[PDB]
């Protein structure tokens, strides 16, 4: 249900390994820790952040 997910991370942020791998194994489709993501459902929809 996701147009594309852009950034993913193990925020606590320890390190965010984004869609290219910068700011230092990819999917194409149209000590307690948590991993966040950012995505938009479609082209015209605003970016929104999801927590796991």
């Amino acid at each position: 249900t996701i147009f594309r997910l852009y950034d993913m991370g193990w925020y606590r942020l320890v390190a965010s390994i984004t869609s290219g791998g910068s700011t230092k194994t990819i999917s194409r489709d149209n000590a307690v820790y948590y991993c966040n993501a950012e995505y938009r459902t479609g082209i015209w929809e605003e970016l929104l952040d999801g927590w796991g």
């Binding site: 852009y6 950034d7 082209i43 015209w44 929809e45 605003e46 970016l47």
Partner: protein, 286 residues
């Protein structure tokens, strides 16, 4: 009396709703400070041309029943001119709106430089002058005749009356699609290629949502205009060269297509009511 007053009901419905929607659009755009934007001047011009088209429907309403055009010569000239201003300016404002949205999306640094509402007024006046240069010769040669039964309005092509007619038909078809439709297709083809792979457009999420909603609204309005106006243009050309015979369904289809072309002016304020949140709030609060 059934089908007759049915057709007059359609005239009254379409004219009243178009005039009310476009007057409300102009009222809310001018009376609010937050609506003065580079892409609300274009909408104001669009709902100016639509109201100009819709204001001639009561005269056709009177002309249908009596069978005679009883308003004289000047009003006939004005109505025939207003039709071509409607068609040309409604197709050029959408093209300039799409190129504006292209500049906004794919060229942010440049679009920050020159997108003030001072520029939009000059583009609107230049567009209206360019349209009027072609729409004034139509008023040059439109007159009320004296037919056998009832007087009617008509375009009197002066010297050969076979050459200028086809020249006007070919010119209107070639220009009022192949320039603006090709420009619009290229502009939105570039916009979608940018919008697919961009994380954020202006660096802020709110600016991202506000920049994508307006582009979606403009694309929906362009699609509505093209779908409403394509069949009459293609059907005029097919009647021009194919030489279709006289059939019981053919005349009704022709008058449907022309009715759709006039009916497109009604829809746009309704689309703006629930495609833009600020327009909906201003309509409700007003």
């Amino acid at each position: 009396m059934v089908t007759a007053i049915t057709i007059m009901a359609l005239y009254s419905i379409v004219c009243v709703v178009g005039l009310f929607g476009n007057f409300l659009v102009m009222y809310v755009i001018v009376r609010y400070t937050k609506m003065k934007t580079a892409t609300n001047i274009y909408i104001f011009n669009l709902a100016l041309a639509d109201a100009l088209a819709t204001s001639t429907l009561p005269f056709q309403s009177v002309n249908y029943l009596m069978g005679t055009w009883p308003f004289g010569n000047i009003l006939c000239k004005i109505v025939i001119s207003i039709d071509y201003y409607n068609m040309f300016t409604s197709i050029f404002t959408l093209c300039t709106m799409s190129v504006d949205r292209y500049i906004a999306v794919c060229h942010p640094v440049k679009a920050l430089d020159f997108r003030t509402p001072r520029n939009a007024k000059i583009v609107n006046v230049c567009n209206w002058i360019l349209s009027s240069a072609i729409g004034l010769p139509v008023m040059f040669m439109a007159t009320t005749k004296y037919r056998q039964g009832s007087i009617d309005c008509t375009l009197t092509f002066s010297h050969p009356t076979w050459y200028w007619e086809n020249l006007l038909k070919i010119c209107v078809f070639i220009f009022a699609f192949i320039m603006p439709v090709l420009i619009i297709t290229v502009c939105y083809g570039l916009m979608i290629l940018r919008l697919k792979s961009v994380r954020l457009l202006s660096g802020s999420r709110e600016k991202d949502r506000n920049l994508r909603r307006i582009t979606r609204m403009v694309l929906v309005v362009v699609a509505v205009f093209i779908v409403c106006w394509t069949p009459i243009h293609i059907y005029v050309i097919i009647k021009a060269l194919i030489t279709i015979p006289e059939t019981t369904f053919q005349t009704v289809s022709w008058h449907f297509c022309i009715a759709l072309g006039y009916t497109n002016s009604c829809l746009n304020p309704v689309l703006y009511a629930f495609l833009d949140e600020n327009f909906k709030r201003c309509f409700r609060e007003f």
